């Protein structure tokens, strides 16, 4: 067992002692704690992953379905978990400030997606099928001045 001495002996102390907690080689290979950030529309997000099979709390000690009563909204903030198989292993904490109803849901998908890659570099290629890492930096266009009340609303 000489190969493990060089690999296991370098991760400890030295450059970056954070990467020291793992769950075997095959089946989880996920870090204990991870962080991720996501931006979508006029809003921001900060999602952190921690070990635990508890419930999901967003902010102010409240449930998840309260913020997103709709079914489609809840599925978008949990799609990466199903593909990666972390359905009931890791916890979820969502913190957002500003935006709207569906605007905040999109930021969570980008924030949580960037956290899984950090925890496991290998578990990042399978997430490209659904285009999770893709974002939308473009925003709403300005209202042009003149006679048009709206962007392109003509008048008689």
């Amino acid at each position: 067992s000489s190969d493990s001495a060089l690999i296991s002996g370098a991760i400890v102390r030295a450059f970056n002692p954070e990467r020291m907690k793992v769950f075997m080689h095959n089946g989880c290979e996920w870090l204990w704690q991870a962080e991720g950030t996501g931006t979508r529309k006029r809003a921001a997000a900060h999602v952190i992953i921690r070990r635990g099979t508890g419930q999901v709390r967003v902010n102010n000690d409240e449930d998840l379905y309260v913020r997103w009563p709709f079914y489609y909204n809840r599925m978008d903030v949990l799609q990466p978990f199903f593909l990666t198989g972390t359905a009931g292993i890791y916890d979820l904490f969502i913190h957002v400030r500003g935006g709207g109803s569906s605007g905040q849901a999109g930021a969570v998908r980008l924030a949580v997606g960037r956290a899984l890659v950090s925890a496991c570099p290998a578990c990042a290629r399978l997430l490209e099928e659904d285009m999770v890492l893709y974002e939308d930096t473009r925003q709403r266009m300005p209202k042009m001045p003149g006679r048009m009340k709206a962007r392109k609303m003509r008048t008689w």
């Binding site: 099979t53 419930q55 999901v56 449930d63 998840l64 379905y65 079914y71 809840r74 599925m75 949990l78 978990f81 199903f82 359905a87 009931g88 979820l92």
Partner: protein
């Protein structure tokens, strides 16, 4: 929902308080449970007919040592509930792969679990 002329200016807009009636008043006194030498009373509130909000328990008659605060269903109990519906031919097809996936969606609440699985095929 009654209407009368017992309002205190703008407190009820001319309505009869529910606790002021005969039948509701008979079942609206918890401090009298001591006189029950034969047995005891019990009550529970879980529906959404009115927002609980603070729900002061000290100014009602019960004490802080006689309140049973239940929590959401545990993952172990959640699995049994889903399997129970299968034997009743309620769901069409519920694969085991998505069993744990639905736990986070509804959060394990009984009201959100039965409604979510009823609208969709389930699983």
């Amino acid at each position: 929902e009654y209407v009368s002329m017992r309002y205190e200016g703008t407190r009820f807009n001319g309505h009869i308080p529910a606790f002021h009636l005969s039948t509701p008043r008979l079942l609206s006194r918890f401090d009298d449970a001591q006189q029950f030498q034969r047995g005891l009373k019990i009550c529970a509130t879980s529906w959404r007919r009115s927002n609980r909000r603070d729900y002061r328990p000290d100014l009602l008659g019960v004490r802080q040592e006689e309140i049973r605060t239940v929590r959401n269903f545990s993952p172990l109990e959640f699995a049994n509930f889903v399997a129970y519906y299968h034997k009743k031919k309620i769901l069409h097809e519920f694969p085991r792969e998505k069993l744990d996936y639905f736990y986070m969606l509804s959060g394990g609440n009984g009201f959100q679990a039965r409604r979510l699985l009823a609208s969709l095929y389930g699983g």
